[PDB]
Amino acid sequence: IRVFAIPPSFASIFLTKSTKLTCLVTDLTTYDSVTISWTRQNGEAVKTHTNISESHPNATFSAVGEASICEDDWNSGERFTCTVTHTDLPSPLKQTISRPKGVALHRPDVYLLPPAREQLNLRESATITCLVTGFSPADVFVQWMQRGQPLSPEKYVTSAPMPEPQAPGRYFAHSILTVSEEEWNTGETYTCVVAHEALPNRVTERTVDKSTGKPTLYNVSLVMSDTAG
Ligand X SMILES: *[C@@H]1O[C@H](CO)[C@@H](O)[C@H](O)[C@H]1NC(C)=O
Binding site for other proteins (CB under 8 A): 11-12, 14-16, 107, 141, 143, 145-152, 180, 182-183, 185-189, 191, 193, 195, 199-207, 209, 211-212, 218-229
Query: Is residue 182 a contact point for a second copy (CB under 8 A)?
Result: no
Distance CA 82, CA 96 (A): 6
H or E element in which residue 113 lies? strand 109-113
Query: Is residue 2 a contact point for a second copy (CB under 8 A)?
Result: no
Distance CA 46, CA 49 (A): 8
Residue 74, phi then psi, degrees to nearest 5: -75, -35
**Residue 227 beta carbon to other proteins: minimum distance, rounded to whole angstroms:** 7
**Residue 120 beta carbon to ligand X: minimum distance, rounded to whole angstroms:** 17
Cα of first residue to Cα of last residue in the chain, in angstroms, is 102
Q: Please name the residues in contact with 198: beta carbons below 8 A apart, sequence gap of 6 or more.
A: 105, 106, 107, 108, 135, 136
Report which of 136, 133, 179 is spatially closest to residue 159, judged by C-alpha positions: 133
Distance CA 156, CA 103 (A): 29
Q: Looking only at residues 193 through 222 of this chain, which bind ligand X when binding is defined by CB under 6 A? A: 217, 219, 221
Query: Is residue 50 a contact point for ligand X (CB under 6 A)?
Result: no
Q: Which is nearer to other proteins, 34 or 193 (CB)?
A: 193
183 binds, among ligand X, other proteins, a second copy, none (CB under 5 to 8 A by kind): other proteins
Q: Looking only at residues 65 through 124 of this chain, which bind a second copy when binding is defined by CB under 8 A? A: 68-72, 107, 109, 111-119, 121-122
Query: Is residue 131 a contact point for a second copy (CB under 8 A)?
Result: yes
Q: Which is nearer to other proteins, 51 or 225 (CB)?
A: 225
Query: Is residue 136 a contact point for a second copy (CB under 8 A)?
Result: no
